[PDB]
Design a protein around this ligand. Structure first.
Ligand SMILES: C[C@@H](Cn1cc(CNC(=O)CCCC(=O)Nc2cccc(C(N)=O)c2)nn1)c1ccccc1
Ligand SMILES: C[C@@H](Cn1cc(CNC(=O)CCCC(=O)Nc2cccc(C(N)=O)c2)nn1)c1ccccc1
Lengths: 182, 181
């Protein structure tokens, strides 16, 4: 691996507790769908870059719990690209949902020619977030005197978030891929 | 060990590696007007071991025959994770001698970004004959022994351009070529 971000796809066995944990989070809002398989994406370069950003965010945001496990539905065609590059380049960032049902919508996890749908269960560095708007290439400024320090993500509702928008590279790790059908 | 899950790794070949240049040179014999984005080696130990066991059996049965060929197979972007894990396993799978046949938008459909995908596949062609439409399996070799069948079917037995494989673990999708026009 010479920064190629090579990866391995590990299919989880249903007897593995990790499969049961991922299936339970998906099943909180998607229990009417049937899971065909859950795979773990093992991309060392992408993981190390994500972990370097998490450590920087942890040392900057004090008591804040910087990480959340969120859902991202995508088409079958984008899966090899997400496994290699993640989601790297309310805003022109990447959208993530708190609830799998939102991501299970056909507009996001479009059914392929065999009726299969794909949703990632992603580690996202949500950090410090605020309410956002349409035209954003980077999140808004925190302080007026210090505008270089910007928010980590933007959300639809700061008190009760249902979705998050990430704008930076290595802010999301596509840990699990859920393949399922209606 | 996998627990026979057929887990795989995708290794992007560096242009500085001879492997990239060998695959690129074979593709370029008929597709030098296209431009390669990347070449990836698919490393699936379970799929490989099963393919190698089929190769050993075919080598023991077919005498002087060169049982293996490196052929091309165009596919849509969406089928790539399925091929990487399951190969072309279960009216068979079509393979082309020349990459330009598989580079047709009918087989290697351009995705939303204009990327096209063709695999460079190790295929156990073995002993082959001319084939027709409705085949779930290849024809019989002998009438008294109908259980012994051809390994593959082709468009032309003397100058093959196309092959059809029907059995499991008969093809190993070794390289994935991502390219555009
Ligand atoms: C009939 C319309 C309606 N339409 C468009 C959409 C796309 N969604 C939005 O515009 C909502 C704002 C973007 C958003 O919330 N994305 C999002 C949020 C959380 C997770 C995910 C994800 N990928 O899982 C994606 N939904 N419906 C349609 C128009 C064009 C294409 C498809 C559908
Ligand atoms: C033995 C003959 C006879 N024949 C007719 C048929 C009916 N099916 C078709 O005509 C559809 C096949 C289209 C084709 O040529 N596909 C092809 C060939 C090589 C590679 C690829 C690919 N996906 O890259 C795709 N099957 N066999 C033959 C064998 C191989 C290819 C075409 C013909």
């Amino acid at each position: 691996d010479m920064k190629q971000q090579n990866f391995c796809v590990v299919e989880l066995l249903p007897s593995d507790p990790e499969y049961n944990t991922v299936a339970s989070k998906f099943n909180q809002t998607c229990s009417h769908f049937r899971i065909e398989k859950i795979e773990r994406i093992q991309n060392p370069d992408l993981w190390n870059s994500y972990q370097a950003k998490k450590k920087t965010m942890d040392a900057k945001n004090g008591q804040t719990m910087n990480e959340k496990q969120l859902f991202h539905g995508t088409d079958a065609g984008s899966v090899p690209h997400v496994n290699r590059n993640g989601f790297n380049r309310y805003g022109k960032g990447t959208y993530f949902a708190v609830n799998a049902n939102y991501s299970a919508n056909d507009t996001y996890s479009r059914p392929d020619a065999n009726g299969r749908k794909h949703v990632y269960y992603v580690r996202v560095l949500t950090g410090i977030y605020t309410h956002g708007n349409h035209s954003l290439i980077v999140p808004p400024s925190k302080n007026p005197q210090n505008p270089t320090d910007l928010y980590d993500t933007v959300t639809d509702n700061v008190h009760h978030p249902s979705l998050f928008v990430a704008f930076y590279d290595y802010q999301a790790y596509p840990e699990y891929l859920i393949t399922f059908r209606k």
